[PDB]
Amino acid sequence: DSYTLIYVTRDEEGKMFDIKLENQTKEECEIIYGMITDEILIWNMILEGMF
């Protein structure tokens, strides 16, 4: 199973980052989540081919 991952962060200076990934395993999304030290504004995992 694979996920689209969309997330938005903000660092201590107030600078903002948008990342969009496709075809991420559950585990890859969990590894990426664990690397983030900046403030999370959005974290959105969506299963590819739900139905």
């Binding site: 585990e27 969990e30 590894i31 989540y33 664990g34």
Partner: protein, 225 residues
């Protein structure tokens, strides 16, 4: 929600059961159990205290609130009834346990064996509405579970506290007696476990302390069912 405690917890917590906050919590939960599905079953709410007396407590493992799905919670932090899938947090606990002792991942998440050997599996919040995590946060439960921690703090025989994540670690403010042992790391959740839970060796750290106190070590192995 009555004081059904059969062991030394009964007398020790008697004054908590007569406070106003507890009466209002009990009335709230009486309504909640009539109207909604609440977990765990009312008779299981205090099982952590029932299985693990004040006297026999060696290690406290704090959780949040009970699992919020059918046939999961039975009044212990982290444990699930036999028959259901192991939650990822507990699977990660099992993976750290495999890493320490070579034990295979058990076919169940039932941790009564830990409680029987003096592991107090205490959630800070002891009820939850079905499918609504933290639905019963700020209703009085943490006045009650704070008192459980305060009492263990006042105990002369040293207590080991395992505090996984910041919310569990915030309870250090109650653990003022420096004879007690504090084991800390990030939470075993898949979203945090790789930031220090894997390799934290909580199990052998506990048993090292129990050996240095002349106390019987804990057999952490969970049998298949």
């Amino acid at each position: 929600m009555e004081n059904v405690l059969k062991n030394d917890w009964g007398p020790l917590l008697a004054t908590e059961f007569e406070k106003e906050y507890y009466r209002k919590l009990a009335d709230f939960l009486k309504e909640e159990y009539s109207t909604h599905v609440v977990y765990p079953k009312v008779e299981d709410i205090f099982n952590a205290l029932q299985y693990t007396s004040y006297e026999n407590t060696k290690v406290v493992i704090l959780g949040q609130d009970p699992y919020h799905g059918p046939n999961q919670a039975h009044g212990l932090s982290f444990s699930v009834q036999p028959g259901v899938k192991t939650p990822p947090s507990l699977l990660n606990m099992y993976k750290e346990l495999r890493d320490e002792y070579g034990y295979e991942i058990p076919n169940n998440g039932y941790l009564v064996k830990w409680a029987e050997q003096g592991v107090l599996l205490l959630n800070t919040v002891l009820t939850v509405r079905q499918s609504e995590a933290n639905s019963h946060k700020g209703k009085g439960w943490e006045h009650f579970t704070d008192r459980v921690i305060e009492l263990l703090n006042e105990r002369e025989k040293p207590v080991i506290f395992i505090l996984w994540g910041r919310h569990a670690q915030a309870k250090k403010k109650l653990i003022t007696n420096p004879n007690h042992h504090i084991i800390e790391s990030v939470h075993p959740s898949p979203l945090s476990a790789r930031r220090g839970f894997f390799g934290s060796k909580p199990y052998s750290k506990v048993n090292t302390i129990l050996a240095n106190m002349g106390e019987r070590e804990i057999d952490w192995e969970i049998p298949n069912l």
